[PDB]
Enzyme design. Structure first.
Site, PDB file in Angstrom:
ATOM      1  N   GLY A  23     -35.316   3.594   2.978  1.00 54.32           N
ATOM      2  CA  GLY A  23     -35.390   2.158   2.891  1.00 54.32           C
ATOM      3  C   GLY A  23     -35.639   1.862   4.377  1.00 54.32           C
ATOM      4  N   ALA A  24     -35.822   0.355   4.609  1.00 55.83           N
ATOM      5  CA  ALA A  24     -36.132  -0.339   5.429  1.00 55.83           C
ATOM      6  C   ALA A  24     -35.382   0.044   6.686  1.00 55.83           C
ATOM      7  CB  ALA A  24     -36.099  -1.928   5.228  1.00 55.83           C
ATOM      8  N   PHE A  25     -34.054   0.547   6.406  1.00 52.70           N
ATOM      9  CA  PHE A  25     -33.077   0.381   7.443  1.00 52.70           C
ATOM     10  C   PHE A  25     -32.327   1.750   7.643  1.00 52.70           C
ATOM     11  CE2 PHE A  25     -32.816  -3.620   5.653  1.00 52.70           C
ATOM     12  CZ  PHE A  25     -33.358  -4.554   6.790  1.00 52.70           C
ATOM     13  N   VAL A  27     -33.176   6.450   6.759  1.00 50.64           N
ATOM     14  CA  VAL A  27     -33.920   7.498   5.900  1.00 50.64           C
ATOM     15  C   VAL A  27     -32.867   8.781   5.917  1.00 50.64           C
ATOM     16  CG1 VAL A  27     -35.846   9.072   6.122  1.00 50.64           C
ATOM     17  CG2 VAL A  27     -35.943   6.923   7.181  1.00 50.64           C
ATOM     18  N   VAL A  28     -33.160   9.222   4.686  1.00 53.89           N
ATOM     19  CA  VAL A  28     -32.002  10.511   4.392  1.00 53.89           C
ATOM     20  C   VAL A  28     -32.729  11.633   4.077  1.00 53.89           C
ATOM     21  CG1 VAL A  28     -30.004  11.041   3.054  1.00 53.89           C
ATOM     22  CG2 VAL A  28     -30.543   8.627   3.568  1.00 53.89           C
ATOM     23  N   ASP A 136     -22.959  -4.707  -0.643  1.00 57.59           N
ATOM     24  CA  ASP A 136     -24.062  -4.251  -1.474  1.00 57.59           C
ATOM     25  C   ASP A 136     -24.175  -3.235  -2.538  1.00 57.59           C
ATOM     26  OD1 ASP A 136     -26.695  -4.358  -1.823  1.00 57.59           O
ATOM     27  OD2 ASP A 136     -27.316  -3.008  -0.248  1.00 57.59           O
TER      28      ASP A 136
END
Ligand code: 51W
EC number: 2.7.11.1
Length: 277
Positions: A23-25, A27-28, A136
């Site tokens: 995602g923009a915010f 990483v996994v 969210d």
């Protein structure tokens, strides 16, 4: 590609080899316990392309999750916060996300919806009692995990709420006003720039149930701006629910998807709704 050596956080290890979320915010990456390789984990890391914002959100996620322990909330095994980096070592949920699953199944039966919503309700009881709002909630942030073997029965699927980076404590005599979340799942009061409380999460839960049932979000607009205008212009919002839907599930959906937060189902009503029994 071939670049990347082994990284360690406490008793856990991972590499950039197995990306399981982007995602923009954040990483996994999939990782494992260093002494027990069969214990899988998910390590969430900063996205350096949005460093400052990523660092903020991961830091918030630690603050919130370190205070929550529940089956239906992704576990935080450990974490490592430093000046220029942040890592969270979380439970590996072996079923992927609810968004992919509801689509692959061609929408979910009412019995499956009940099973998952009972579990979501249990986690929300804890968040509500702790004075936490998630902000969210969406199928993409509900993860699946099955404790049983390969090819195990669907009745054994357990769900976990994840991605608490936008969550906050909200004192019970106060209101929140940060515009954040995901536009198709956001309560109307949030996207319309008004103050809001925990009832915003209940709207989002309504949208989750709706998407499990139909494969779609309840209010389609051409853009987030058009969606805000839509809520602003229509004081009466009623989503297209399939006609064969059971009356008790339809009632729950309409109670959660009330435009006006005053009219919307409250937590007590949600926890005790007969669809969950
Ligand atoms: N959407 C993923 C969320 C990432 N976060 C977590 N994901 C899992 N478990 C898990 C299991 C199976 C599959 C996946 N997703 C993937 O493999 N991909 C998605 C993009 C590239 C491929 C993820 N457990 C804990 C967490 I925190």
């Amino acid at each position: 590609p071939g670049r990347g050596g082994t990284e360690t956080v406490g008793k856990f290890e991972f590499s950039r080899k197995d990306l399981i979320g982007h995602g923009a915010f954040a990483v996994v990456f999939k990782g494992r316990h260093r002494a027990a390789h069969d214990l899988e984990v998910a390590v969430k890391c900063i996205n350096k392309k949005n460093l400052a914002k990523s660092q903020t959100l991961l830091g918030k996620e630690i603050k919130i999750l370190k205070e929550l322990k529940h089956e239906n909330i992704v576990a935080l095994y450990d974490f490592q916060e430093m000046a220029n980096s942040v890592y969270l070592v979380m439970e590996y949920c072996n079923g992927g996300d609810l968004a992919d699953y509801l689509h692959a199944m061609r929408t979910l039966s009412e019995d499956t919806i009940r099973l998952f919503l009972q579990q979501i309700a249990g986690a929300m009881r804890l968040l509500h009692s702790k004075g936490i709002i998630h902000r969210d909630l969406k199928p993409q942030n509900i993860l699946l995990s099955n404790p049983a073997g390969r090819r195990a029965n669907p009745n054994s699927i357990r769900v976990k709420i994840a991605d608490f980076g936008f969550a906050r404590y909200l004192q019970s005599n106060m209101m929140a006003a940060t515009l954040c979340g995901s536009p198709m799942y956001m309560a109307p009061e949030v996207i319309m720039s008004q103050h809001y409380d925990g009832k915003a999460d209940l709207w989002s839960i309504g949208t989750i149930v709706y998407q499990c049932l139909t494969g779609k979000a309840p209010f389609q607009a051409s853009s987030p701006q058009d969606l805000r205008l839509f809520y602003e212009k229509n004081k009466t919002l009623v989503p297209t629910i399939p006609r064969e839907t059971s009356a008790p599930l339809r009632q729950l959906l309409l109670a959660l998807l009330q435009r006006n937060h005053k009219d919307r189902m409250d937590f007590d009503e949600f926890f005790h709704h007969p669809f969950l029994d």
